[model samples]
Target: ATFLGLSSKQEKALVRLDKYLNLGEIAVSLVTDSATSIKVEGRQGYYQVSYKQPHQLYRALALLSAALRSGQDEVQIEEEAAYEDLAYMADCSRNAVLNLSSAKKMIEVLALMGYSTFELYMEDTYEIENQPYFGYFRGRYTVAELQEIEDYAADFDMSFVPCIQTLAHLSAFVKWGIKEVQELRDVEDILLIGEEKVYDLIEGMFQTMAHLHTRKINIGMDEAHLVGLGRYLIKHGFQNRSLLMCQHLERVLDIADKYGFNCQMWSDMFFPEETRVYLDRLKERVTLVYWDYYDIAFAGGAWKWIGFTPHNHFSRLVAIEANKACRKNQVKEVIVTGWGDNGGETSQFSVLPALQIWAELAYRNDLKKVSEHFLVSTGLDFDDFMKIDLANLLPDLPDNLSGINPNRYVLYQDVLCPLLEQHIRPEKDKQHFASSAQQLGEISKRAGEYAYIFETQAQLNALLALKISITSGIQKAYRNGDKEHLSALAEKDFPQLYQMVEDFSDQFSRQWQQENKIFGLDTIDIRFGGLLKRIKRAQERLEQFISGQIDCVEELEQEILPFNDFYKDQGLTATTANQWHLIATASTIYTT
Candidate 1:
């Protein structure tokens, strides 16, 4: 095929570049007398690249030379047309800090995964408040370091956008308190009710971030619940949440515009339900970043339902649909975001599969192809990927609850359960118990699993303590022949589960607050509520079981029999058949 300014001549030519080539038993001389040609004499076939225009031919030759020199594939070219923009964002404000090398490696991985855009979520990291000692806790990414990553990303054709929180500096600039920076300090941390110093801290953070970036900035104005409430309410008469948020966002946007940069913010901040009037009024000014991490099909296991984890699938879908709707209504540039940060303990790799699926959905809207391609690429069955290991993967349940050890539960729930359930099944369930028992039997097995590295002796002791507390309660229920105690255990201990979750929540919140000031009470409350709702439902279901709402006594008895047999086989009277029978009955009664 050839293109020319005028008429182009076509001619049949025979050329033999190589012999001994066979095509359907027709051995003949293959010829191609063109600008570039590959012919085989034994095979009656020829491939050629020809151009009637000399300049066009020269350009094509140069491109071919460059591809060959760079060891790039010419036959199977993967065009950058897949995603108009591909991005990776890192939240440095949270305690889960990434060193420069880690950040570099993250970008490299993103590039390999076909991402072409990057966002460095700089909060406490780049901007320092008045005091140097306070900022020591927050590792600031040096301009040089950021430039290194930025330049590296550019090599892969990625645009690294700088993201900074202005109104709600969750992890950065939160220490200065509300009295110091009223307009900037949008809300108070839920746990730190009396402390109003975060406002000033966050304002300083915004100023610092605004000064650092030049091209584009992401002023995180999302999830600022107490927009005009709190100490701000005391200073300036209560304004509407939407108005307060809009005013704050406009201030940040103005700052970015003044500095010759475009600005982006989370769409949740201006969504219809939260700020319907504001979104209706100002949808055009802001670039909405729609974050949908869970909508795509999961590859490993039924992580959503079984893990008692809320799949972000529905949330992401809503965000995508909302973005599309907003775009139709005159909103500009929708940036899709995928985030994962839960006390550095969350599965870091868990979001990758979902992210790929989301990318396909967002870019192509090829739902069926996304499913087929994901399964083929990852070698995971579609059915197993949708299942969730709720009981196994959820974070530490309320303190004294029974069923599974929290830490081990989460480990198994996230990694092991997924691996088994995805590849294996009814057989996987059997293997799960068998493997757990075998692994537990061998203390040495702990060293083999990377997931168990976090399990300290203290954690084991805590699990033992929780088990003892739960068993004692169960024993009392069994002795008194009171099934209600089991139900009460689920209800009463539910608070403890909440407390345990709060323990981690408080840690995450405090860590974020200590490093960044934008994270307010509203942020903590919403995230905490989301976490609690999952645990509460699980507890409630367990309570129903204890109350005999579900008929699975036989299965429950079967699960407990191994422990009973172990005790009886060891000649231990305390765990004999009778004791096992009583314990099993109590468990069944409580769970029923």
Candidate 2:
């Protein structure tokens, strides 16, 4: 199946390799894997790479080239395909910060990593004609913008798939309450399942996406929690959710058919035992994205939740098991997804550990071998990048250097409305995180080529540490009945907290503006800005109390109840809400 000369795909990949990547020349020879084995070796001052699949050859060429230099570039590496179609779903939904250039940079990284397809998780982040208010003020991608992404990705032989919502997660658009769309809304983001207008709007979506050269689309019928239970229940009268969902899916697929698009969806939203059942009912064809970011094979506990705390961590094993389950259940393609739960707080690049794990498991199940292979593709040392995980997980080491991510836990420990105090702040826990933050920063200083990314993670860790330190001091001073000390801590530390917010905002803006447009970041800005406002208010209150202008520090007088042992089993709390309860509220401050 070899093409005689460079196809447009091949020519563009070669150009990308030379322009952005310093990796040397890699001439490709494609064949069938079972007939002839894959090989990459250095000769004639260049690397000669061979693979069965044309896409694989291109993927390998970029990766091996990244790892090689002028001298002794001879390398031999081979792998049979894993998963057949490996797609990376870059989240452009919740965080909405990916700039066009930034999205292209993501494509560049995915290509180098051997990903076959590139997609965005769009929840009303794209435009459709005749729906002027649909994505208004949301900064959705214009047709030209999405087309640029589609074309840019095509050069590397990457499939630029469009993953959009045909059902739930459409709250981003429905909130506008336009006449045509509002008539079809149910509770939350789920569309009115029984309405023709629902399919009409969806037909528009499919037509809009038809402009792209994508062969597939992800119709996100995932997590439409109250499907048919809201307005649809009254309109259609207590129909089975299963029947409702399948019917809607059938119609969505029909619309897709009209547009010449194949479709897929998140399998997790369907009943655990109901896959084959739904497959039979719909009688339509599509792939499944069996997604999970947690480490199921290694940890094996669903109760050990992530996103809320750092006690548990994710492993690459989830992808292996999910893909296995998908295949066994009569599905063809499996798209593994890594999610950043809220406000896109987790840096997109940090998910490499899980993605690397899947890449290895896809081709071979050797962890160590995969580690080296991943390093070659990423141009990162296994040891250093692995340490980045410390930012997300609780380290077992007695050294107590790293702590949990800042703001992730503020839901329970707001500067004002505090909970989970004992679970979050122990003296030992605080210092350990401080140490971890310092070490992460040190790693960034030495990150050589990828300093911007490492530096961002380092900034997050360090800011999280400052947050912890403030949480601990505020809690102790108030509990000690030392208004005097509390006042000083407020004046001293609150000001510092404010500045760190500014600095982090600057860092965040630098990354966001580079990767996303300047508009959507106000979501991030407003939250952190609120934290600064709360801190300022707390400082003012402390000044009043220290002056003996008030008889008691009322916000501190009442006790904050402890969380269930599970919430704070590791132990302790931190402090500052402007009325005086928070030292840790921005990203984790989901409460207000």
Candidate 3:
């Protein structure tokens, strides 16, 4: 349908919607009416949509599109705000900053889904003036890039809040040898306290946020566990840790205030006692942010994060319970966060299914409507999206909550020094991934514009189908001294697996470049390069062993045990390791 009395932003929305689906033979016009809620009514030939705000226009278009897709006439849809703000926060700092093209597409989808607020959780991935060391060599966004996003978001009546770190999670900057960042570090990634220079750097961060045209800034103070125990402790001879946090907040707030910003922070480090005693002392009120992107089965498995795959099933489960708690308690603000825990390996598109569910639940209680809207808006079946979770599943594990990401640990683990090999049952795991890959291939064909996301997963699962069995097979052949079998695997399976890994890496690289800025590609590339190099090295060592050049494959001689068994002495036990380095080897990756 054509549109009238529409602003440029509204026109842009219509243009995108039209590109998605043909709206010929019908016209739409924005008209002022005291309908209270967003109301749409069909007239003689055009539809008149009544909206109290600009964001409602997108919802109006969505409703119109659904009706058109259903081939229905005499359409009317009215929806009211369920919350003051429903936000979708994407983690851009974890080495995958969404490029403008993808960001705009995401904005379009969120608008159709009726989200009110959007935030890119950028720790060190944004440009800060005079802070060249901050997010340097990282894919940091220029002011112009962010300005374009902010302006485009404004068209949808969505607030593009600047989510930045003022205190902790600045590991990107802490790594730099620059003198400015060096002095700001207290310990770990925590910024030093009681230092004017640190405040100046934070002020610079605020100055960057100010340019984004947002007064609302999320000053991340989430995991500064070693706040005063670092440099501050040595300098001051021990001080009250709680008071130190309060003091740090005051300083950060002062900087935020200077930039005319209102601030909110993650309430992780605050003690229960401090909530009553220490918080009352503060001149400002602090609200709680209840975030859980993990399931309860494995006590919120770490593998659900940091891996190449996303457990959308677990994500939905957790979001359901979390949102229920929020609704029962009448919590007004809700944010569905997409975090790239380790290296941002998961595609941003992976989070869309969860985001759709979260947005639907925010406004309504019915699942039927949610699924219906999801299919219409995304142009893919909701079930197909949920099926992406199969990339991490096995029959022995709990489907809903086990949250085992085999694609990640299996793909990244070292061939010779594998950690999670105990969990790998070749016959079972191989069949599971092979079937999953086949299913994904079918879904990819129907995915249309979203084909890349599914296609990438297809290649990943196909690689895992073969990769998961190799470790156990190699270990068994070497332990049994089966030279003939070992030689065959070394000659045939290893080379085949290497080629598959290379192909998967190429597909993954294409997916990354298509969706994200080129800055973070180096990190993922390095990871793939290391994996490929390790594969070739393992093949060489195997060939040497087969040819009698080496008496023993040293790594294979060690007894394979449950991952927890090896770490049990250190008082640690886990079914999976989320860190790539931890999964890759038992040796020290970094030395002092």
Top-scoring candidate (TM-score):
3
Error of 1 at 554 (Å): 29
Question: lDDT for model 3, on a 0 to 1 scale?
Answer: 0.76
| Model 2 vs. true fold: TM | 0.83
Candidate 1: where are CA atoms >4 Å away? 1-83, 129-136, 169-187, 190-214, 268-283, 291-342, 359-592
For residues 412-489, what per-residue lDDT tens digits would candidate 2 score against the true structure? Answer: 245544454555545555565567667768878876655565666566666666666666666677777787777677
Query: Per-residue lDDT of 1-592 in model 1, one digit per residue for the tens?
Result: 1212222211110011011111122222212233232111111222223432221222222222223334333322111122234455655554344555555545544543334566766655663557353344555665666677677555444567877665554444445554343333435631122233544444454455444334766766776566667667767777776766665565555555555666676777655355665556555765666653321111111012211122334433454555355435443233434332333333222233454444444334435444443332233333333221221322322222122222232222211011111211223333343343333334323323212211222232233233334334444454455668767767676567557555545544443333233323343455456546755554555566666787432222322223233323333222112111132123242233
Tell me the lDDT of model 3 at 344.
86
Error of 3 at 173 (Å): 0.1
Report the poorest 10 consecutive residues by lDDT, candidate 1.
12-21
Candidate 3 C-alpha RMSD relative to the actual structure:
3.8
Per-residue lDDT of model 3, residues 1-592, tens digit only: 6678888767776766666545567888887554544787895567888876678677667767777666767877776655567777788988889999989888888888877777898888888899888888888999999999988888778988777887788888898887877888889888888878988888888888788788887777765568888887887767666677777887887777788887777766453466446555543544445455550100111122548888777776776676676767667677777778888898888877777777766666435566667765688888898777777766656544434567788888888888788767777888988999999999999998888888888888888877766777888888889988888888789889999988888888888998988887788788899989998988898999999999999998887767655334443222445777778777887654
- RMSD in Å for all candidates: 16.4, 5.6, 3.8
Deviation of model 3 at 423, angstroms: 1.4
Q: Write down the lDDT that model 2 would get.
A: 0.61
Model 3: CA > 4 A from native = 29-37, 43-46, 269-278, 281-287, 295-304, 400-403, 565-574
Compared with the true structure, all predictions reach lDDT values of 0.40, 0.61, 0.76
- Model 2 shows how many backbone clashes? 30
Q: Could you give the candidate ranking by lDDT, starting with the highest?
A: 3, 2, 1
